[model samples]
Target chain A: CPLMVKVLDAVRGSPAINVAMHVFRKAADDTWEPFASGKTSESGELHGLTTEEEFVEGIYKVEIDTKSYWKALGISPFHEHAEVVFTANDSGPRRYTIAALLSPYSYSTTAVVTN
Target chain B: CPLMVKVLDAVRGSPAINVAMHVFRKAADDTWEPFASGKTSESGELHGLTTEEEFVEGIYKVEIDTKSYWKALGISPFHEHAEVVFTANDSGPRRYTIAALLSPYSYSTTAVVTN
Candidate 1:
């Protein structure tokens, strides 16, 4: 499995939620370039952002756009966005979860490394 | 001028924006420990988050809660919050701008290092 993200609310399960994810790879110019983009499903989970052809082990950034999610609930968020910078390895079939634990005042992400 | 943030909107300048900033210093356990926090002012700028007594040169994380900003405008933001992970050196009187360029579906942050 490629990198996946699960957005969870503090009080309720964020179902039928909409979020945007952007994958950026560090380039030779030492600049991060956008590699891919996608949206989460009704289950609030996004997967397979990096194509198998372009996959490599390096420092990457997964930016999640979650402003719309909070607006749907009529709440204001403290942070305007979430940036998850992680290094991908050659490990096989590993699944990483960007668990976005969110609320109006606070939010956090935990990367669960598993097979 | 010690690490101030100015939040600008996609269409208009954000003013009287309330945001929460968390400063975390990397501990020996590789965990980020919260050192300070405060809110942005009416001009949508926050300063003096790091006291002169506790300043250090290390990798730090600044988590800004920005959901409320969009909520005030009655819009759904694609990014719920913004996480700014920056390196602070022993540079003097430096100001860092976490310029949150925001919209309903997209957002970005730029760190301006100045003396």
Candidate 2:
């Protein structure tokens, strides 16, 4: 089956700093639209742009700059970047959020399904 | 005013995989206690262990294994670890969740206050 929805997280890969993130969604006909943008607090939390009422059964994508965060810290890392992709179903419960962790050199993300 | 509560986020500074997090809270007498523990999802979402109903007025701290995550990826970083500390007011709205993001050698986190 095709991915119905997705969420992502990323970081520049450094501590003692903050990062930025943006969300993109796919429409029925197949097009990408900018959903929203947010900043990772100094502690690193970034919630999804879409709220419970905003979701309507579809696919989505997210991206983060793991390189910049690390560059700011002046720390070299293994991975220059990281990405996460998944699908969401409209049925049942949906409290979905994409989360990520990053240091000055590497990053990771997860697609969370909530109810 | 005295800090009534706090939440924190940490990372190992690596992303290709996942990381772990543990939360600690301080009592009125000034002692740390394990509040809850959690693992960062592949996308990097690590929700706080304390729910709205569970939170009490207090101070808190969180620590992440930034060095370990990067070491796992065979990458080196500037800071081997990271920590976050903050106070949560018992009166205002509260949907507090400490979140983090990580890559193979870098990571980030933020303390989120929710309603």
Candidate 3:
């Protein structure tokens, strides 16, 4: 079964805060390519989401715009970004859900595919 | 550069629930291996952490025992587990932090390395 991998940045905040997301794929050779890009909606969902249908049965990477997401708050993190990589084995378009929980000083992401 | 990748399964509970963590490396061939294993402490912090100093500049994967952790509640989730992938580049020991926050019905994981 092929799976439709969807990455969500579940940002909790005021609608005033702008959240952006960039998803990437780590090829077997160790290179990364932009798979999809999106932004948060009015509900602080960071709904800037994208999908990759060409992804074969392997591990893919997701990068969140924590730098920009926090810049609006006049703050920064130890690093310029956050990342996640997960495996998907779907021959069909299956629903895979991933989420990012963010706070003022710390943030975390969870990746789950149809297991 | 070589990096010391450490994963944290931060379980927030009443010290009654047990949390277990399994770390894996997705070799270039698409196979996963158990790298290290640990469990959360009494703080509901499933700190069963692991580290791989031999990891070259490449991508790695981590798995969470969500099924077992959640089973403690006598409930089953849509999936039996969770996964995370991240890249680390450290010739020496670099501190890489990854955390997982879990609740009764939902859970999230965040993977971060020296960026």
Candidate 4:
């Protein structure tokens, strides 16, 4: 996967399963536009969100509906969603992996970049 | 300190020293107003941001100036800032910690909640 996401549940110590996700890109006009959308797999991973040519240099944000996901798991969370935002491919074309950890009221994210 | 933040430099694999931070709380009128502001310490952590009485139940966003931090370290980052956003203390009073890892082109964050 050129661009991927891995989400883990801090409360359960497991991969966050079946969470809804929306991937967005910043257009030249500074509007946030969606390019792809999907859900986390059983292992809490989503792949093929963006292909090589499709993934150009720009800013992107990954929005996860953690509030709804946790309610389905029997807990009402504090936040509306978990968001990871950053710029991509500034120096060169590189693959990126966003790893996120979540709790009912908290969230953390990290990124891995490689050629 | 009832709230804290830890920032790590993913590219350098060390504590992200001297990154500037601003903390905002969502007010009753749906405006994000600042509560505290500071910079990460040498250990890449910031404490005493919010006191017990000062921290009411609300939504929060931690804004870190990763672009300036990286530039001070001689690398211009791809982000204007690194942001960690979530709601806080839904049920009762609780402590929260936000840990973040940053690269020039990527970022991640996680939360640790406790008594």
Candidate 5:
């Protein structure tokens, strides 16, 4: 796949199941135009968000609904939401992995790209 | 201080210097009122965002201007900006560290808290 997201819970050291996400692409007017949305699977991944053809060169944003993720566990957490955004280019056939580590009061988003 | 931020550049494998940041606290009206603002130092850290007395139980947000940081280095990044939001509570003598890892097309935010 061209794009994939993996979410892990740092507090529990496991995949963050069912974390909801919404994605958008920047429009010509500089507004976010919706592209896709979904929840992570049991393995903390959502790989089918877009296709290699649809993943063209542009700016993209992924909004992760982490507040609900923590609230479901009966723990009040910080952050209304977490977001990861990036620019894509015409690189050689490469795969992008967005790895997110979540804690109640903090989170980290990292990227691992390989061809 | 009880609150701080540390930023790293995953692309160059070094500390991300001069990253501008803005801090805010959720007010009673549910609006994010400005709390503090500063830039990451040469060490890629801003350890004086707030203090224990001011960092009481509340929701806080940190806006890290990663776009400019990358753009300054003559690279085009994907995201408009990166944000970390979370609720804070009384937890003894612990300190909160917001650690961020950034790349051209991806980023990760993780929190390290300790006494």
Candidate 6:
């Protein structure tokens, strides 16, 4: 299955381009095992973050370096990290889009099966 | 096992007194089934939220009404709600404390097995 993610600056109602992204798959030991990582493009989108082998049907977490992103813009975000956790199923190579909305002092997320 | 939670106002370094709390246990269907809910006391604590029947070895989430909590104090928070997710195990009636640290615009959490 393919997992896609988009990051947005909620306050500005604009795409949060260039934000660093880290994805992890939760292990049976309840530890987050790193799966893949990258940065959003100009469109604030990261496509196919998971491959067939990497994308298992289980619990997963995505972490955004919101502190670094805001720091680069000379703003101090309240929290050190912004993370979202969701579950991926074994139905098919279905596409899932997880959208993260970030503000200097807050973070929010929404997930849906796109295809 | 027993589940306890404490809420704190990180910026003020004091208890987040009178905050509303809602606990949910994640089911196999990925639906969050409400386990228990209440309000934090003057000391910002919710003790023994999980009874023997309610306690299970699985994933759980706790949601705090931060917006309402701050609103009552005459402040507006960035987000509507603050939530934390963790997993509990089958260890004998163990005491697990989940602490939520909240700022005006940010939220953080930590979990530890107390006894």
**Leading candidate by DockQ:** 5
TM-score of only chain B in every candidate structure: 0.81, 0.68, 0.65, 0.95, 0.94, 0.87
Lowest summed lDDT over 10 consecutive residues: which window, candidate 1 chain A?
A101-110
lDDT of 4 by residue, A67-86 (tens): 88999999967667877777
The local distance difference test score of each candidate is 0.67, 0.53, 0.53, 0.83, 0.85, 0.75
> What would the per-residue lDDT of candidate 2 be over residues B58-82, giving only the tens digit for each residue?
6767776666766666777666556
Candidates sorted on TM-score, descending: 4, 5, 6, 1, 3, 2
lDDT of 5 by residue, B29-109 (tens): 988899999999999999877777777887888899999998899987766678887767655556888888888767777
**Candidate 4 residues B6-93, lDDT tens each?**
9999887999998899999888898879989999999999999988898878888888888889889899665668776777776778
Distance from true location, Cα of A74 in model 4, Å: 3.8
* Candidate 6 runs further than 4 Å off: A91-93, B1-115
Per-candidate TM vs. native? 0.51, 0.42, 0.46, 0.71, 0.71, 0.52
Model 6 residue A107 lDDT score: 64
lDDT of each residue in A1-115, candidate 3, tens digit only: 2322232333434442356667676677877777776665665454324435465666666666666766776664433455555555565336565566665334555544453
* Per-residue lDDT of A26 in model 6: 83
Tens digits of per-residue lDDT for model 6, A1-115? 4888888986678899899989888898988899889999989998867686767788777877887888888885554566666566665337777777777755666556655
Which candidate wins on lDDT? Answer: 5
lDDT of 5 by residue, A9-105 (tens): 9888899999999989999998889998899999999889899889998988889999999999988775778888777777744788888888887
- Write the residue-wise lDDT of candidate 1 on B1-115 in tens digits: 5667776666565564676667677788978888778888877788877655466676677776666677777864434466776557645545556665555444556666666
Which residue segments of model 2 deviate by more than 4 Å? A1-115, B1-17, B101-108
